[PDB]
Amino acid sequence: SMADEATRRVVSEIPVLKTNAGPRDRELWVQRLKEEYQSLIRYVENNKNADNDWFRLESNKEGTRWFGKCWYIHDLLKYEFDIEFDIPITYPTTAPEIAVPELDKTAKMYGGKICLTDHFKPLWARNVPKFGLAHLMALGLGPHLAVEIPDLIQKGVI
């Protein structure tokens, strides 16, 4: 319950996605992407109320390449990081691999691609295709930054 209660507490205000289709899937992809932007923009607006407007994302015309910025705040000091990911052909079953290239200074990184907890993959698999890029940010990058950025600051690499 407690895995289930926690996820829900983090994402219940984020629009659930419905369409089970990846980039190759024509109108279903077009519909999927509209769900991605729907879910992304509500999260971002909710984040403004939370005084935790911690990321911007944008995509190419076909919505297969993503890039943007995240912001972490430690001891009142703000840190910015460039982020990117491509959409796997197998999305939304296969979660994308988020890259923070400029950190490629930490061991939790293979080219620029961060290393999430072993707990993320099962968490994503249990929810396919309801979770999207909003949830990847909310349940993946978010908790990663809360462990990684304090560690790197302490290690004097940031």
Side-chain angles (χ1 to χ4, degrees), residues 1-26 28-44 46-47 49-60 62-76 78-104 106-107 109-158:
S1 302
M2 176 170 177
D4 288 349
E5 184 42 39
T7 303
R8 181 182 303 134
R9 289 280 178 168
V10 173
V11 295
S12 74
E13 298 177 323
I14 309 183
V16 164
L17 290 84
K18 152 175 126 62
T19 301
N20 201 345
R24 295 182 179 162
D25 287 337
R26 302 286 89 187
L28 306 191
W29 186 226
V30 154
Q31 173 51 32
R32 182 59 187 200
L33 255 178
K34 292 180 194 177
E35 303 184 345
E36 296 294 354
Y37 282 96
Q38 158 171 299
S39 291
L40 269 175
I41 195 66
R42 172 55 62 84
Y43 186 29
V44 161
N46 287 358
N47 283 345
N49 289 354
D51 182 39
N52 193 54
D53 196 10
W54 69 276
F55 84 87
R56 288 283 172 288
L57 266 179
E58 49 176 310
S59 79
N60 66 343
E62 317 93 324
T64 58
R65 308 319 192 236
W66 292 77
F67 84 118
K69 277 164 190 296
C70 65
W71 299 278
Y72 193 71
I73 289 192
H74 195 253
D75 297 349
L76 304 186
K78 178 142 78 192
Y79 299 84
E80 166 177 300
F81 316 93
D82 291 2
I83 63 166
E84 40 192 277
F85 55 90
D86 299 346
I87 299 315
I89 298 324
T90 48
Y91 188 81
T93 291
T94 308
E97 293 170 291
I98 306 205
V100 197
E102 63 200 305
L103 286 175
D104 182 305
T106 171
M109 165 156 305
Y110 29 102
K113 304 180 193 196
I114 67 177
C115 276
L116 298 178
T117 199
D118 307 348
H119 318 139
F120 184 71
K121 176 117 76 196
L123 174 52
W124 184 271
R126 278 186 299 180
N127 286 281
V128 161
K130 292 194 286 214
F131 286 5
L133 304 182
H135 301 73
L136 176 66
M137 297 301 275
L139 297 161
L141 193 43
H144 195 254
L145 286 174
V147 178
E148 265 298 293
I149 308 307
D151 186 49
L152 296 169
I153 286 159
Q154 110 135 278
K155 277 154 184 201
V157 302
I158 279 182

